[PDB]
Structure 1
Amino acid sequence: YNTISITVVDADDVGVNFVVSKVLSTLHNKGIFNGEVGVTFPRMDKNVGDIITLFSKTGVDRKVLTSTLNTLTDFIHIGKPKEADKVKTYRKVDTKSKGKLIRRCIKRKGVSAETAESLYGNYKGEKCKLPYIVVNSKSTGQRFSMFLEECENSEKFNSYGLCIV
């Protein structure tokens, strides 16, 4: 599908992945990822990279995303819409640690704090070591790291531009 590049210009002032995460948050909160625009980073290694690449089939134009990422125009670079037969979609993978499933278990099974705690004691502690972006959610008022790993392409996308089901 045809695609557009979004490039973080060299930023001595800030972390490059911090600009990447702010770009992803602004693309998310100002629409963009309707269910078709999805990012892809030709430079995902240890980090997510600096080159973001949005690939709506319908087509992702610049006028829209230069006015969307206007708060980011100080150190962002928007490429021209080019074409690619395949894009490596990444998907959202979440990390589980303890208190999430402790409260999930006493909410569902009707167990006791101590019962759930005992059921999960010698378990849990997931620590993904995958490239990531640190994202500030708006519906829930905290910050978190969204982890990204390569999987097969899917027809539909989410609001962060990763793959769904």
Structure 2
Amino acid sequence: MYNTISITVVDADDVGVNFVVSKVLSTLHNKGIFNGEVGVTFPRMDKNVGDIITLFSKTGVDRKVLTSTLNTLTDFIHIGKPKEADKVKTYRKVDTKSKGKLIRRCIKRKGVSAETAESLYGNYKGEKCKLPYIVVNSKSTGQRFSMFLEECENSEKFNSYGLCIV
């Protein structure tokens, strides 16, 4: 089995649920949690995650360090008791890069140069790389990606928020 504990966002309609949810997941990642042995799951996700953010682990979530790392947002937050269940819809983030990014790698590496080479690869762009399930956070580099959460089955290896491979 795992070890699950749920943080539910409540009384944040002043400031919007999803904004809080993103702030919470951010503060989690920014310092401490998700040391490779925690991951995240949203049991009420439909569009734009939802009202519940559960954390799971096989080595017991520290219910008390949560309440002091979420101390900046504790007024919009209800942390639940450690309950348990065997089964956790696991998610992973989906990247879609713009074409200008693609072209810089294709100039610096992937052998090419000048505009004529932009037009070679710049032939047809993503046309419509739409995506679903956002959570927003500004990374340490200095940009604001729009994380996309796709359901994958259990990888049992996570880095920061979501799944990985081995």
User: If the length of structure 2 is used for normalisation, what is the TM-score?
Assistant: 0.90
* DSSP-derived class of the 2:39 partner: coil
Question: CA 1:89/1:133 → structure 2, altered by over 3 Å: closer, same or farther?
Answer: same
Distance 1:119 1:141, change over 3 A: same
The equivalent of 2:68 in structure 1 is 67
Preserved CA contact (<8 Å) 1:39 1:52: yes
**CA 107–95 in structure 1, closer or farther in 2 if over 3 Å, else same:** same
Identity between Structure 1 and Structure 2 (%): 100
| Aligned counterpart, 1:29 | 30
Q: Secondary structure at the match of 2:159?
A: coil
The Cα shift of 1:115 comes to 3.6
Whole-angstrom CA distance in 2 between matches of 1:104 and 1:44: 35
Q: CA 1:61 to 1:131, structure 2 compared with 1: closer, same or farther past 3 Å?
A: farther
- Compute the displacement of 1:163 (Å): 4.2
Do the aligned partners of residues 126 and 135 (structure 1) sit closer, same or farther apart at CA in structure 2, a change above 3 Å counting? Answer: farther
What is the Cα deviation at residue 113 of structure 1?
Answer: 3.7
Cα RMSD for the two superposed structures = 1.9
Tell me the CA shift for residue 74 of structure 1: 1.1
Deviation at 1:120, TM superposition (A): 2.4
In structure 2, what is the Cα distance between the partners aligned to 1:163 and 1:87? 15
Report if the CA contact (8 A) 1:92-1:163 is conserved: no
User: By how many angstroms is 1:136 displaced?
Assistant: 3.1
Q: What SS class does the counterpart of residue 148 from structure 2 fall into?
A: strand
Q: Greater CA deviation, 123-132 or 145-154? A: 123-132
Question: Which secondary structure does the structure 2 equivalent of 1:95 belong to?
Answer: coil
Aligned length: 165
Contact 1:39–1:162, Cα closer than 8 Å, also in 2: no
